Design an enzyme around this catalytic site. Structure first.
Site, PDB file in Angstrom:
ATOM      1  N   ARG A   1      -2.682  -2.140  -3.531  1.00 50.94           N
ATOM      2  CA  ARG A   1      -3.883  -1.366  -3.393  1.00 50.94           C
ATOM      3  C   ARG A   1      -3.840  -0.221  -4.379  1.00 50.94           C
ATOM      4  O   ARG A   1      -2.765   0.478  -4.605  1.00 50.94           O
ATOM      5  CB  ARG A   1      -3.902  -0.998  -1.945  1.00 50.94           C
ATOM      6  CG  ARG A   1      -5.109   0.181  -1.914  1.00 50.94           C
ATOM      7  CD  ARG A   1      -5.491   0.918  -0.243  1.00 50.94           C
ATOM      8  NE  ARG A   1      -6.510   1.943  -0.665  1.00 50.94           N
ATOM      9  CZ  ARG A   1      -6.275   3.115  -1.260  1.00 50.94           C
ATOM     10  NH1 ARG A   1      -5.144   3.407  -1.467  1.00 50.94           N
ATOM     11  NH2 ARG A   1      -7.290   3.739  -1.270  1.00 50.94           N
TER      12      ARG A   1
ATOM     13  N   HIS B   1     -13.574   1.700  -0.136  1.00 54.73           N
ATOM     14  CA  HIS B   1     -13.670   0.740   1.006  1.00 54.73           C
ATOM     15  C   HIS B   1     -14.197  -0.706   0.260  1.00 54.73           C
ATOM     16  O   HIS B   1     -14.536  -1.558   1.097  1.00 54.73           O
ATOM     17  CB  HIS B   1     -14.573   1.104   2.221  1.00 54.73           C
ATOM     18  CG  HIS B   1     -13.757   2.055   3.224  1.00 54.73           C
ATOM     19  ND1 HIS B   1     -14.750   2.855   4.025  1.00 54.73           N
ATOM     20  CD2 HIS B   1     -12.595   2.334   3.374  1.00 54.73           C
ATOM     21  CE1 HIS B   1     -13.908   3.686   4.558  1.00 54.73           C
ATOM     22  NE2 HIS B   1     -12.599   3.360   4.266  1.00 54.73           N
TER      23      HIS B   1
ATOM     24  N   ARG C   1     -14.118  14.490   7.982  1.00 57.34           N
ATOM     25  CA  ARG C   1     -14.824  14.621   6.776  1.00 57.34           C
ATOM     26  C   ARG C   1     -16.292  14.667   7.157  1.00 57.34           C
ATOM     27  O   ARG C   1     -16.951  14.192   8.008  1.00 57.34           O
ATOM     28  CB  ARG C   1     -14.727  13.587   5.852  1.00 57.34           C
ATOM     29  CG  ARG C   1     -13.619  13.533   4.637  1.00 57.34           C
ATOM     30  CD  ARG C   1     -13.285  12.102   4.279  1.00 57.34           C
ATOM     31  NE  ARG C   1     -12.486  11.384   5.147  1.00 57.34           N
ATOM     32  CZ  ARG C   1     -11.963  10.189   4.637  1.00 57.34           C
ATOM     33  NH1 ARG C   1     -12.474   9.679   3.334  1.00 57.34           N
ATOM     34  NH2 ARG C   1     -11.246   9.264   5.161  1.00 57.34           N
TER      35      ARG C   1
ATOM     36  N   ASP D   1     -10.338  11.842  16.793  1.00 57.79           N
ATOM     37  CA  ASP D   1     -10.125  10.493  17.195  1.00 57.79           C
ATOM     38  C   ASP D   1     -11.602  10.167  18.029  1.00 57.79           C
ATOM     39  O   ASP D   1     -11.914  10.922  18.955  1.00 57.79           O
ATOM     40  CB  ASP D   1      -9.027  10.261  17.943  1.00 57.79           C
ATOM     41  CG  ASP D   1      -9.063   8.892  18.806  1.00 57.79           C
ATOM     42  OD1 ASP D   1      -8.798   7.791  18.058  1.00 57.79           O
ATOM     43  OD2 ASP D   1      -9.270   9.050  19.741  1.00 57.79           O
TER      44      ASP D   1
ATOM     45  N   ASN E   1       0.937  -1.123  -0.048  1.00 55.94           N
ATOM     46  CA  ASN E   1       0.029  -0.056  -0.142  1.00 55.94           C
ATOM     47  C   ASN E   1       0.721   1.284  -0.109  1.00 55.94           C
ATOM     48  O   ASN E   1       1.520   1.349   0.963  1.00 55.94           O
ATOM     49  CB  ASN E   1      -0.962  -0.086   1.256  1.00 55.94           C
ATOM     50  CG  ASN E   1      -1.734   1.188   1.230  1.00 55.94           C
ATOM     51  OD1 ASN E   1      -1.784   1.930   0.186  1.00 55.94           O
ATOM     52  ND2 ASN E   1      -2.670   1.320   2.385  1.00 55.94           N
TER      53      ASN E   1
ATOM     54  N   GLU F   1      -7.669  -6.073   5.072  1.00 54.92           N
ATOM     55  CA  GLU F   1      -7.658  -5.657   3.401  1.00 54.92           C
ATOM     56  C   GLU F   1      -6.365  -6.524   3.009  1.00 54.92           C
ATOM     57  O   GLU F   1      -6.343  -6.762   1.808  1.00 54.92           O
ATOM     58  CB  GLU F   1      -7.543  -4.340   3.448  1.00 54.92           C
ATOM     59  CG  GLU F   1      -9.130  -3.772   3.593  1.00 54.92           C
ATOM     60  CD  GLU F   1      -8.952  -2.326   3.451  1.00 54.92           C
ATOM     61  OE1 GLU F   1      -8.743  -1.552   2.456  1.00 54.92           O
ATOM     62  OE2 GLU F   1      -9.103  -1.505   4.643  1.00 54.92           O
TER      63      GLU F   1
END
Lengths: 395, 387
Positions: free
Chosen positions: A89, A178, A239, A281, A8, A380
């Site tokens: 990825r 995702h 976001r 967080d 990645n 993943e």
């Protein structure tokens, strides 16, 4: 037993795992970060040890060299020839990639053509594909696209009610992200239930610093919360997720916001951080809220509501729900988030068993619930390794 | 019995209804455009072809002249539609003097509609000084929304300093058809979990639980929410900065994109009118067929959110131009909802009966004709004639 490496590659980072397949055993993992900067650090971990060193790292070409050297220098492999395949990825596969693909010259050509859609990820992703094809030329590689799994979305789910010109010419449409995570925890749910995924109506919630929801019916993805960009959908760390679109022209007029100010707003200043005023967080907002911060409390409450609203849309779209999955940092660990998200759902036959939820057991639905509710750790890299085996070692 | 006048001032228009209260009987109704003046009664009609002061003068001259009222002093009340009442008005308001000030200080939020509404409130105060006036706000019904429903996950500053939040609109409609549904069932509205779909040229969905709006699909502006005639409703917000960097679109151009070019018109590339798109679809136009599907999908997804939020559903209301007349739009919206005990009876839906759910169905599904003017007239009775 096969050695597969999951890669990645970020703007200034190189994440990697090395997996013994098909058992999925982690042989080693690590991270190279702040590439090209000062501060550059290389961290590597085995089942038994950890090594961490700050040292200058010119570019990704030097990050990959140090990684390959460390594999033998630390005894993790007897030789680089033990590496049977590499999985990369890729942020954005567009409409071209319905699946992972064997890396060849034109697969690279296309991934680079798609940079215009993921300008801050897809090129470095392809650079990693290039460096490993240079540095490990005998090893077959597979690109694994974060959009591929959502490509089964029907047009009435990916088309925005904009003028047709904006899809047909500019390519604007829901792609969703995702994909690897939703795909991985979908299949893991079905294996754990001993049922074909095609027999289940599933909603999957990936709640991390990035958050997205996905609807999976008939083994395929039929909707997901992120859109043209990973900005959209539910509320996240920084976001905003979906907001009244008409807010944005109004801030241009009233506050003279540039295109990039608007995007820094939507991607970096909002979410838990912008509402709580405390942190991006989840743990930190929860700590602030529990002490009496009302904006942190509302933050956590708004967060659960946005996810609840998206879940509701997808249950409606599938005409029902057989199982709800929680994954990612928040979803895998926050029994309180799961409880707030799952409250008052008797109209679906959904309720949680509090003892199992506090424990984050793998199944947490109440004894007499009709809806299975699963806590599944996402992996993943394992999923990527499985796609490498499939397309690069059909053996 | 009392005589109440309902008024709706548009930027180039003036609509009116004069009801006998509280029966609901209409004494006359009409419209003035191109500021063309139409006045219909129970058994007559009177169109002609000739600023807003001239429209009020002629309209009030007409009620005496055409014989609907023997005196201008038989009007007991007048109600005025106002578009946006911000946070300050949680209900209709007697038009005392600085109710008008605050309607106009809010004109920065409803730039096109609020000043024109307030204009008409003033003129009626001039020309009809003896008769009290009530303002009825399209936003007031939705002021029961909890903060989880109206705060966007933007930095707190954008709300606490600039006033960005969900307001919602069609409040008078959603309020009217909610209460009509409950009256037709003989049950208090607060006994029902209701989803109300106002499907006109503008489109909004509203969740009513315990008698209150708990969510609604339009937000800061009447642009957002579901897909509409020319409005996009909600889209991926990141599309907009992209359109500025890749096509240099100004702010007003972005507004025109989301409000004037999208919706049924943008997708079908045929018309903003649902019946037009419908006929292009039957003839084989594939964009028009896809527009119709997107339209039902967007509304279905919003309903799903609201059902989830309420913990269930007891009744689903269709109202508005599309919602009252389009069996197809209701059927497309209502398909495969057995997990809720919701299904349609084809024969009842085909003739738009007031109740169209199947007989075995747990959820009431209702087609109710919206009547904002009767809802406004009722707020005038409550707030200006409390006897």
């Amino acid at each position: 037993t096969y050695k597969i490496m999951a890669i990645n590659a970020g703007s200034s980072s190189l994440k990697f795992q090395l997996l013994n397949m098909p058992q999925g055993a982690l042989l080693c993992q690590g991270l190279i970060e702040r590439i090209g900067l000062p501060e550059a650090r290389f961290t590597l971990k085995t089942s038994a040890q950890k090594w961490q060193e700050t040292l200058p790292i010119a570019d990704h070409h030097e990050a990959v060299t140090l990684l390959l050297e460390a594999l033998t220098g630390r005894g993790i492999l007897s030789s680089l020839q033990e590496i049977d395949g590499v999985g990369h990825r890729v942020a954005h596969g567009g409409e071209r990639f319905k699946d992972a693909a064997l890396v060849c010259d034109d697969t690279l050509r296309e991934i680079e053509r798609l940079a215009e859609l993921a300008p801050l990820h897809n090129p470095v992703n392809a650079l990693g594909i290039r460096l490993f094809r240079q540095l490990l030329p005998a090893v077959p590689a597979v690109a694994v696209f974060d959009t591929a799994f959502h490509q089964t979305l029907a047009p009435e789910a990916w088309l925005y009610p904009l003028p047709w010109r904006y899809y047909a010419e500019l390519g604007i449409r829901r792609y969703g992200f995702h994909g690897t995570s939703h795909h991985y925890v979908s299949s893991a749910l079905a294996e754990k239930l001993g049922v074909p995924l095609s027999a289940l109506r599933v909603v999957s919630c990936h709640l991390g610093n990035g958050c997205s929801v996905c609807a999976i019916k008939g083994g395929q993805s039929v909707n997901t919360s992120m859109g043209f960009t990973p900005q959209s959908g539910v509320m996240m760390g920084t976001r905003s997720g979906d907001i009244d679109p008409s807010i944005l022209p109004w801030l241009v007029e009233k506050e003279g916001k540039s295109a990039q100010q608007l995007s820094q707003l939507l991607n970096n200043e909002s979410g838990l951080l912008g509402v709580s005023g405390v942190s991006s967080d989840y743990r930190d907002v929860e700590q602030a809220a529990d002490a009496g911060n009302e904006r942190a409390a509302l933050a956590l409450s708004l967060f659960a509501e946005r996810i609840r609203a998206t879940i509701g849309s997808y249950i409606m779209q599938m005409g029902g729900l057989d199982a709800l999955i929680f994954t990612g940092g928040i979803g895998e660990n926050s029994a309180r988030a799961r409880a707030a998200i799952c409250r008052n759902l008797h109209f679906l036959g959904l309720a949680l068993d509090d003892e199992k939820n506090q424990r984050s057991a793998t199944f947490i639905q109440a004894d007499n619930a009709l809806v299975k509710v699963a806590v599944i750790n996402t992996n993943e890299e394992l999923m990527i390794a499985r796609d490498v085996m499939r397309l690069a070692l059909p053996q």
